[PDB]
Enzyme design. Structure first.
Site, PDB file in Angstrom:
ATOM      1  N   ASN A 185      44.454  35.456  35.225  1.00 42.79           N
ATOM      2  CA  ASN A 185      45.650  34.826  34.949  1.00 42.79           C
ATOM      3  C   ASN A 185      45.552  33.224  35.883  1.00 42.79           C
ATOM      4  OD1 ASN A 185      47.042  37.416  36.097  1.00 42.79           O
ATOM      5  ND2 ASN A 185      48.057  36.258  34.035  1.00 42.79           N
ATOM      6  N   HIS A 187      44.278  32.621  39.089  1.00 46.44           N
ATOM      7  CA  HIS A 187      44.677  33.075  40.629  1.00 46.44           C
ATOM      8  C   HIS A 187      42.694  33.435  41.159  1.00 46.44           C
ATOM      9  CE1 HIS A 187      48.623  32.773  41.332  1.00 46.44           C
ATOM     10  NE2 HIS A 187      48.767  33.121  39.849  1.00 46.44           N
ATOM     11  N   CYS A 222      44.226  31.339  48.468  1.00 46.59           N
ATOM     12  CA  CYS A 222      43.049  29.781  47.875  1.00 46.59           C
ATOM     13  C   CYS A 222      43.610  29.409  46.860  1.00 46.59           C
ATOM     14  CB  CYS A 222      42.156  29.778  48.405  1.00 46.59           C
ATOM     15  SG  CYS A 222      41.046  28.524  48.384  1.00 46.59           S
TER      16      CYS A 222
HETATM   17  N1  EVE Z   1      48.945  36.310  45.464  1.00 49.85           N
HETATM   18  S1  EVE Z   1      47.695  36.103  44.172  1.00 49.85           S
HETATM   19  O1  EVE Z   1      47.146  37.542  44.370  1.00 49.85           O
HETATM   20  O2  EVE Z   1      46.338  35.251  44.692  1.00 49.85           O
HETATM   21  C1  EVE Z   1      48.383  35.934  43.175  1.00 49.85           C
HETATM   22  N2  EVE Z   1      50.151  35.053  43.244  1.00 49.85           N
HETATM   23  C2  EVE Z   1      50.295  35.204  41.704  1.00 49.85           C
HETATM   24  C3  EVE Z   1      51.540  34.678  41.166  1.00 49.85           C
HETATM   25  C4  EVE Z   1      51.844  34.677  39.516  1.00 49.85           C
HETATM   26  C5  EVE Z   1      50.696  35.784  38.998  1.00 49.85           C
HETATM   27  C6  EVE Z   1      49.500  36.165  39.423  1.00 49.85           C
HETATM   28  C7  EVE Z   1      49.352  35.663  41.068  1.00 49.85           C
HETATM   29  N3  EVE Z   1      48.599  36.536  41.556  1.00 49.85           N
END
Ligand code: EVE
Ligand code: EVE
Ligand code: EVE
Ligand code: EVE
Lengths: 263, 265
Positions: A185, A187, A222
């Site tokens: 995704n 991230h 990050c």
């Molecule tokens: N906070 S994260 O775990 O890095 C995270 N936020 C997200 C928002 C949309 C899709 C995947 C994600 N992964």
């Protein structure tokens, strides 16, 4: 891999790869964390998913708030490790995913891990409590009686972590993710943060000690264009307090602790 | 995994992992390169190595990659099973070659192929040398003696000469440095890390609209644990081709050069 007989947990075996091991010819803690993530994903897939159909409509996702890992023995290159995982509801706070690592030949427990997950809107990044509608959809896949990887009272997985004060004893600055650090995704993968925390540990500690326990709190992510500074101070076995923050404004992204045993 | 019936090649199946895939939910080229390295390591182990021969360890000699060439027709999806067959061949006193064939385990179709050229080097002085007869005899019993090429073709892309990128570069990614996960068990930077660093100077728009079809990388010098690298790219071109250069951030010392070919999705 497969769900167990009762359908309330999942097991999978992994053969440790040549590029997955460190100088001791045993799996790194990052390899272990990738394997925990992989068995969690296979568990979600096997039961029909880890977003539910109502979470998808509401644009809600599960995000890691805390990860705690304890390793007694790291598996060697070519060894087979068996990992069992399961989930539990923690009421309206969120969910917990636990893991047990075993040596496939002896059957002995070589490690254990636990993680706390919270519900967040993917777009606004606002945390929400777990609704009844979502809770009911998840509960049929979880054991209803308590099942804890870390049952003990006052155990290390639930300890409060303080904020490292400047000046740090050790540091690694200008850390930035490359495309291999991202998930499907786009991230930053949670395991990358464990790697960045460990970058401020001196090489002398890594050469003479084995990492026994790591507890990491995730505060903020990050982004792809962000730059991180990794800070460490000895608090003592050897124990360290850790802090990851953005290189520019000093915004905290993670805090944690590590415990190391002399070889 | 296992050696085939004749004992002259090795096969292994891999299930593509969740963290091993990119935005398309298919394996990255770095995942593919790690799997090629893993099946090569398992092949060496199955035939008695620990890939240093008996005479190599006493003489402090090792095999090092001079060039890697990979062509992917289809990247395996997350959860898919890919089967990889690998084998080695002697190239007289120049060095050795390791080749690979990637197949979809369900259809049996060839989804990719790779080749690599290896040279003998003294571990301590870093001086290259020709392969001696005593060493050549020790590894010929594990190689097919008739030619077996992953890239047979007469004017194939695996043997093309790569030029040196001229300043100014069209694109760049500055200040790249290895972390402990980028090192191998001997504390040297893993060869796959260099593929990742080359790809860092490709714009995200190319990655979003194209698939990487071919990558050829020449290894000139290694990046040490305390080194910092600059990744440079210039378009040389339906398909898009790029010329690449990795060099040390300070003195501009070349560590790698390469080319990539991308086809529109
Ligand atoms: N906070 S994260 O775990 O890095 C995270 N936020 C997200 C928002 C949309 C899709 C995947 C994600 N992964
Ligand atoms: N997400 S990243 O790995 O930090 C990344 N994004 C990129 C966009 C263009 C060029 C290189 C990049 N590297
Ligand atoms: N040139 S290299 O492939 O990065 C390399 N050199 C080496 C010397 C000793 C042990 C392993 C090595 N790997
Ligand atoms: N560049 S590295 O080999 O991954 C590395 N990171 C380090 C952090 C502290 C001390 C030595 C280190 N070596």
């Amino acid at each position: 891999g497969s769900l167990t007989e009762d359908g309330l947990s999942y097991k999978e075996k992994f053969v440790v790869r040549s590029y997955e091991v460190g100088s001791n010819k045993t799996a790194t803690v990052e390899t272990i964390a990738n394997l925990l993530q992989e068995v969690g994903c296979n568990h979600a897939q096997s039961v029909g998913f880890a977003t539910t159909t109502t979470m998808r409509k509401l644009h809600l996702i599960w995000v890691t708030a805390r990860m705690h890992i304890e390793i007694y023995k790291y598996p060697a290159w070519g060894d087979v490790v068996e990992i069992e995982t399961w989930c539990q509801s923690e009421g309206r706070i969120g969910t917990r995913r636990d893991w047990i690592l075993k040596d496939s030949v002896t059957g002995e427990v070589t490690g254990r891990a636990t993680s706390k997950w919270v519900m967040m809107n993917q777009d606004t990044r606002r945390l929400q409590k777990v609704s009844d509608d979502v809770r009911d959809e998840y509960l049929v896949f979880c054991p209803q009686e308590p099942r804890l990887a870390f049952p003990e009272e006052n155990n290390r997985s639930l300890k409060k972590i303080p904020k490292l004060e400047d000046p740090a004893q050790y540091s690694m600055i200008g850390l930035k993710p490359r495309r291999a650090d991202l998930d499907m995704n786009q991230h930053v993968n949670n395991v990358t943060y464990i790697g960045w925390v460990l970058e401020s540990i001196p090489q002398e500690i890594v050469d003479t000690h084995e990492l026994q326990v790591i507890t990491l709190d995730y505060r903020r992510e990050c982004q792809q264009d962000d730059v991180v500074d990794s800070l460490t101070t000895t608090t003592s076995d050897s124990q360290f307090l850790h802090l990851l923050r953005l290189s520019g404004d000093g915004q905290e992204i993670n805090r944690g602790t590590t415990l190391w045993r002399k070889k």
